[PDB]
Write a protein that binds this ligand. Structure first.
Ligand SMILES: *CC(=O)N1CCN(Cc2cccc3ccccc23)CC1
Ligand SMILES: *CC(=O)N1CCN(Cc2cccc3ccccc23)CC1
Lengths: 304, 304
């Protein structure tokens, strides 16, 4: 019992983290097989950041200008290319610690583990969600970019995130491992506002299921509601619209607690309309939306 | 910027996790050098758990009755001893992945990373604190015991916790790596209530410092207070008494924010007396007490 914001074990990803230096800029790279992936803004001076022409900047750069360090051993760079907003540095050595991996582009509402790194050294690990506005609420200092987000399915690491940006509102933007930004964000020092940060309704409901399973049931009520009726209250409170897909995805949690999804929707409505009245649910004073139904099943069943 | 409940990278500890089976009971063990540490209740049938005589139970057991599996390879057990509430199984092979390590007994209020395991396989990692009542608020299912808590100082892993118990109130009790329980808890199926779960005042203040550093400053006020005056309000709200040691430990955070510790105490008093009024601090609706001053410094400075 007990329910905690849990990251995947970071071991497999620690073995992939290197330091990448281009001139006076050091950040993190991901070393898989004989390629090192890093943010392309590694080639920039902070002056370049106001309006960088990455193609023109990159012409001035040679293989030997990319200093790649794995632990305290230097890797030899034999090739370099730009793919969207990432550089791929070809090294002459395959990472012997390369795990089975995939690059996946995640959907908003989906959760991943971040291994925060500085100078290719891991400092810690936390669980994130891709926000509906394609931002993440990270912990990222200068030197932290090239830090990655991942899921692990048993022995396969699916890389979903590379860290690139902090927005002047202190939230975080980045790319998938093919270098395409989540959201409308660009690797340039320009006015960029995050959109409305809406709540991942299906994740709140999952976390209400997790609460019930873990004995916190005070918020359960005598009421039910409808998708249309529930969604009127969601709208008012900047919650994502709930769909039959979401309801289907909650089915297993429904089945195990024997609480219909729409009854839990009615509980959630009362929580939105009435607040918590100073009470807590799994030790939280607000509604947690960064556990997926899949996350809840995993943590409440002990999947390794 | 941004501030997250961060665990240490779990890599070094993943390489130490094995499965331990005694008859029909499988839990996790920690493999360091040529010793495997596990909870001694591995030798129990759930019938034994009502009033186990561990010495008498252990006489019936031989080296060959302790099945130790590291990944999918069996370790040969050449010795077995009980130290307090842990077994030490001597194996003929030193763990080649043994990191530099220490066993430390932590103080209440101190924080550690947990690597939750099932059948010697890591499922995830989360950050805990030792509560003033010597419980932790974990996520632990059946098979999770022998899962460990740790800190990492650069390359040295200090093991502080091994998981043993869930209390009927769904909080968690366990031992240091010398097998001594934190708190008055015993590895027996008996009436055992956790004491008052008081708030780690120095950790709340640290987390208020972390908030200020990360731009969340609404709760800052025009007031100050005194240790004695602040502690009257702490008492009323089941907060730990604040001492000059605590104030000294906050000094660096004081220095960096230029907010005197006693001014922040006055902010905390107003938060206790007045509540949050529906506002949030670092995305939390209650006062977080599971970051230490040391944790805040680390995360707001990027220590690897
Ligand atoms: C990524 C990291 O660790 N830091 C933040 C980004 N910075 C370079 C950079 C990249 C994109 C946009 C942007 C805007 C303003 C300033 C800097 C920027 C490197 C360090
Ligand atoms: C540790 C774990 O994964 N589980 C919980 C503990 N249980 C055996 C055990 C140990 C101490 C007390 C106690 C009390 C009641 C029932 C079982 C108990 C093994 C599984």
């Amino acid at each position: 019992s007990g329910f905690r914001k849990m990251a995947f074990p970071s071991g497999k990803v620690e073995g992939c983290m290197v330091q990448v230096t281009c001139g006076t800029t050091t950040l993190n790279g991901l070393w898989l097989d004989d390629v090192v992936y890093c943010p392309r803004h590694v080639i920039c001076t902070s002056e370049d950041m106001l309006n960088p022409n990455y193609e023109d900047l990159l012409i001035r750069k040679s293989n030997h200008n990319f200093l790649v360090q794995a632990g305290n051993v230097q890797l030899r760079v034999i090739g370099h290319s730009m793919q969207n907003c990432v550089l791929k540095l070809k090294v002459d050595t395959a990472n012997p610690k390369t795990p089975k991996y995939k690059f996946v582009r995640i959907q908003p509402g989906q959760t991943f583990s971040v291994l925060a790194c500085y100078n290719g050294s891991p400092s810690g690990v936390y669980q994130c969600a891709m926000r509906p506005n394609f931002t993440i609420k990270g912990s990222f200092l200068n030197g932290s970019c090239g830090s990655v987000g991942f899921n692990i399915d048993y022995d396969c690491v699916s890389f979903c995130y590379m860290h690139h940006m902090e927005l002047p509102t202190g939230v975080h933007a980045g790319t998938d491992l093919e270098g395409n930004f989540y959201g409308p964000f660009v690797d340039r020092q320009t006015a960029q506002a995050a959109g409305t940060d809406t709540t991942i309704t299906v994740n709140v409901l999952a976390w209400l299921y997790a609460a019930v399973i873990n004995g916190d049931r005070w918020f359960l009520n005598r009421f039910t509601t409808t998708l249309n009726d529930f969604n009127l209250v969601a709208m008012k409170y900047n919650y994502e619209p709930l769909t039959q897909d979401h309801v289907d995805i909650l089915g297993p949690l429904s089945a195990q607690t024997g609480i219909a999804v729409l009854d839990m929707c009615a509980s959630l409505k009362e929580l939105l309309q009435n607040g918590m009245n100073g009470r807590t649910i799994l030790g939280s004073a607000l509604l947690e939306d960064e556990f997926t139904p899949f996350d809840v099943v995993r943590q409440c069943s002990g999947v390794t």
